[PDB]
Every structure is written in structure tokens, then in C-alpha cells.
Amino acid sequence: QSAVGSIETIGFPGILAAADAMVKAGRITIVGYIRAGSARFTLNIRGDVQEVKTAMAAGIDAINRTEGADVKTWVIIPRPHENVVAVLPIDFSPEVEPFREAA
Amino acid sequence: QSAVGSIETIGFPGILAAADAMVKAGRITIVGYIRAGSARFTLNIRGDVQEVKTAMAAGIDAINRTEGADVKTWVIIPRPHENVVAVLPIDFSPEVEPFREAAE
Amino acid sequence: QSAVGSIETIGFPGILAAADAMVKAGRITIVGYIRAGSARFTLNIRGDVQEVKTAMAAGIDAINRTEGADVKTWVIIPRPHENVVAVLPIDFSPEVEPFREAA
Amino acid sequence: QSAVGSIETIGFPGILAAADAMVKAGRITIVGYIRAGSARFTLNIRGDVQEVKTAMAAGIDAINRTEGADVKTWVIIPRPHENVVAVLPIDFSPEVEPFREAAE
Amino acid sequence: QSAVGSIETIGFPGILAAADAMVKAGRITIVGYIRAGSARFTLNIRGDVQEVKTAMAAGIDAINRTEGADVKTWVIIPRPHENVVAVLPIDFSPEVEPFREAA
Amino acid sequence: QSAVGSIETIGFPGILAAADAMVKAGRITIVGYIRAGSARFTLNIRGDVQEVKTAMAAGIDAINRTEGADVKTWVIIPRPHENVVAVLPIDFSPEVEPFREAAE
């Protein structure tokens, strides 16, 4: 059960920047995003914990350079419990299977 | 009915941190989460009341240590009424039945 | 047409506490809850007006003891009009029929 | 087209109070409500314009007397255009046809 | 491709007033409304640009006289691009075809 | 992958103004919009990076000239990753294929 990383920002441009920087910085899979409310958006990624760590640093840096975006909150869980993956939207899916493989 | 615990924070990373810490700290089942609005998220758990208490303390501590997350509100109900379980999203489901058995 | 009681708080933990205290304090049926927006939640109950009054007092007290919850607004209508029950989500349903009977 | 009245408050208890007072005060039909966002709720009524006026005054008074509720905005349109009735949620429906006949 | 006008206010009563004033002031079609979030509502209309201009003035005046309503933002586009009409909800539909004809 | 541009404003009239100015200023395709919450709207465009840049400048100028609208945030990604296009709503669709061909 690979690590999960999650980041949230105000505004969609910021989450787009975060997502592109994250997948290019580490061997990770973007497994989903959330329209969280109040114009906040969440991005969730999976991979080896070191890859998630590097991607997260790059996603934070990308948001901070995006005009009008700000990092609100973020976390990395190295070994998420099966119950967590079953309930929260952080599991894999066929749409992202091509990018799990390369990862 | 087994006890129910509920915790709410601003932001999804905080509820993810709470969820993982809670299920690792006690013999509980995560039965659901809520996108509450205004970027707040709710997590609901079930189990024996002492296990829920231990899990809740671990969930609060996890949120406190998560950047940008704060505990907004929480509660533990030791013996929720059947009408409450039937109307509010705190009941078990097939998706979490493997974790109820392990917990139970 | 039995009385209707409605209470709203900030946060789901508060509405869970209110709902449990209300059904245990009076011979009432919880007929629904609303995700009202802005993290506010509504609970609606039905029963004899005296039972709704007692339940409401217990629901208010429960919210006030819940960490981080606050009562935003509440009302009791003793004899709601049929047009009100038809349009607003305060009618009974099969999911709650078991608890209407005992009530 | 019969007149339309619309009232909005913060919180569902307030719109419940307005709804009951309005239909009891005048020969009107409640045709719908809206979860408007930010915990605001809208109620829309129809009927003869004098009946809508009497109902609106009773709805405002009910909200004023409901704890935690305040009247945010309201309007009465005496003769709404057919294109308005067709696009906005202010038309009658089978669910309220028994109350339109009683009102009419 | 006829002009499009868009107006947004806080509260549904204001958008109802705007919509009625707009269709009565000009030879326009109301093509939709949006629950935009935060209790804001959008109204979108189409027609000859001069008709849209007159309707918009009447919709603004109607909102300003509605108790508790306020104009938040508005725009008129005289000749909207086909790509805009395809993506944004400002095109015609069967529900409003009767009122396009008269217009 | 062609470049992606994204812009966000408060209110729908502002995103309508941005959309029209953007597609008229550059060889771009509008691929979608988002009702982001809190009355904010997002517009997403695709095309060659120089065309996206020209369009973005025109979109910002349009929003600046629209009453009650302000540019809240925007970005341009020259070469978005395939996993980004597959998960976020920035890909082409049949609805806009006539405008992709004209743009391409």
C-alpha cells in the first residue's frame, strides 16, 4: 500500500500547477482531485514515499509561484490503512492505471 | 449499537491525517466522510466506546500536527439511537464490512 | 398532522449530538437532515407538540455541550400546513416508519 | 399568470416558519423552496397579488420571531412573464395542485 | 449569433425581479439562470444587442429597488463566439423556443 | 500535449467576458468552465503556448473592464502531463472538436 500525498489550494489554476509539477517531479500517480468548496481544490497522489515527498515539494513550489494561489494545507501518509483507502477517494482506478504502471 | 465518533476539520489533508491516525490507534471502523461545505470535511467512526475515545485523541493529535488543519468540532456518542443510525450517514456498509469484522 | 421541530448548527458533530439527544428525550421521529451549506446542518423531527418541545430542549442542550458546536437557529411549528409538508423535507418516509410507529 | 412572491432567510428553520405563516395568512400556494447556498433558503409562493402581499407580511413577521433567522431579501411580482415562469422554479407542479385548487 | 447579456445578484428575489423586468423591457429571451454559490444567482439573456442593452438597464433598475438585493456584476457581449456558446450555458433550448420566436 | 491556460474570477459575467475575449484574441479552444464555489468561476483553454499567452492577456483585460469582476488567479502550463489531462477537466471533447480543428 503505497504512500498518499494530499495538497489543497484556493483556486483551480493553483491545483493545475501543483498537479503538473508533482507528476513531473516524482514517480507518482495523480489519483484524483476534489472541488472542496469555497473555491478550494484538493489533489491526491500515490507512490513510493520518497517519490511522494519530492513531488509534494515541487507541488508546493509550483503553487507559490502561481499568481493568486496559496497553499492552504497538505499532508503525506507513508503507509495508509486499507480502511482509509476504501473510504476516502485516494485509491487507484482504470482512468489512471496507465500512469500507475510507469510509476 | 456501537459508539459513534465524529470529527471535523478545514481541508481534506487534515481529515486524511485524522482518518489514518484514528484507525491505527484503536479498534474502530471508518464508516464514512462528508464534504460538509466551505472546505470542511467530516469523518465518522464506529466501535467500542473506549476504542473510539482512544482513536479520537489520536485523530485530534494528527490534525494538530498537519500544516493548515485545525480541529473545528468533534463528539462521541456511546449508544446512538437506531433512528439516528438510519437517517444520518453513520451506519456500516459492505464497503467497510471487512474492517468491522477485524474491529469486532 | 403532528408538530415539526427544526434545529440547525455549524458542523456535523453538533447535529449528530442533537439528533441523539432529541430522539432519546421525547417520543419523536427524526425525519431527515439537511447539508445546508457553509458546513451547517439541519435536523427535522415530528411528533406530538409536547414531545417535540422536550426533544428540542434536549437537542439544544446537547449542541451546547458539544466541543465546537453552536445553535444557529431553531423553530417548532405545532400544526404545519399540508402544503408545507408537501414542499419542505419534513414528511415521513419508509426509512423512518419503524420509529413513527413506536412514537 | 398569478403573482409570485419570494422570500429568503439564513437557515432552514426560518424558511419553515415563513412557509407555515404564509400559507395560513393568505390564499396562496407554496410552489417550491431553494437551498441557495451559504445556509440561505428561498421560498416561492403564487396567488392573487393581495393574497401574496398579506402572506409576505406574515412570513416576514414569522422570520422576525424565529430565533437566529433574519429576512435577507424578498420581492413580489404581480404579473410574471411566461418566460420567467418557464425558466425559474416558480411554476406549479402536480405535487402542489391540490393547494392551487384550494387557493384558486 | 445574437448578443448575450448576463447579470448576477445576491439572493433569488433579486434575480426574479431582474428576469421579469428584462423580458418586459426588451425583445429578449431568458435562456437560463445559475445558482452560482454563496446565495448568488446569475441570469443570462439573448437578443439583438440594442434589445439586450435596454433589458439590462431595466434589470439593473429592478434589482436596485428589490429589498435586500444588490447588483454584483454584469456584462453584455454583442457577438459571442460559437466556442463560447457551446461551452457556457447561454445557448437556446426547446424550453425557451416559444420566446425566441416572438423575439 | 498543447498548452493549457486557466483563469478564475468572481462571478459568471466575468468568466463570460474572459471567454469571449480569449477565443477572439488567439488560436485557442475553450475546453470547459468550472463553477468553483463561492460564486467563483474557472475557464480552461488549450492551444499553442504563444496563442494561450496572447489569449490570457486579453482575458485578464476583459475581466478588468467588466463591472464587478476581478482576476483572482491564473496560470499557463506549456506542456501538461498526460496524467494531468486525464484527471483534471482540461482535455478536449466532441463538443469543442470543431473549434480544436479551426485552432489546430
Author numbering:
A (entry chain B), C (entry chain B), E (entry chain B): 4 to 106
B (entry chain A), D (entry chain A), F (entry chain A): 4 to 107
Describing publication, verbatim:
These data, combined with sequence information, confirmed that whilst differing in enzymatic contents, all BMC shells are built from homologous proteins adopting two structural folds. Here, we investigated this possibility by selecting the four CcmK paralogs that compose the shells of carboxysomes from the Synechocystis sp. PCC 6803 cyanobacteria (Syn6803).
The crystallization of K3/K4 hetero-hexamers was next attempted. We opted to increase K3/K4 abundance by means of pIsep-FPLC, a chromatofocusing-like purification approach. The pooled fractions collected for this peak were used for crystallographic assays. A condition resulted in a hexagonal crystal form diffracting X-rays to 1.80 Å resolution and displaying two molecules in the asymmetric unit. CcmK3 absence in crystals prepared from samples of K4/K3 hetero-hexamers pointed to monomer rearrangements occurring during crystallization. The crystallization of CcmK4 from CcmK3/K4 samples might also point to a higher stability of homo-hexamers. Despite formation of 2D patches noticed in some experiments for K3/K4, the assemblies were smaller and less regular than those obtained with His4-tagged K4 homo-hexamers (right), which basically reproduced previous published results. In comparison, Tm of 89.2 and 62.3 °C were measured for K4 and K2, respectively, whereas fluorescence readings with the K1 homo-hexamer changed slowly and weakly with temperature, which prevented the determination of a Tm value.
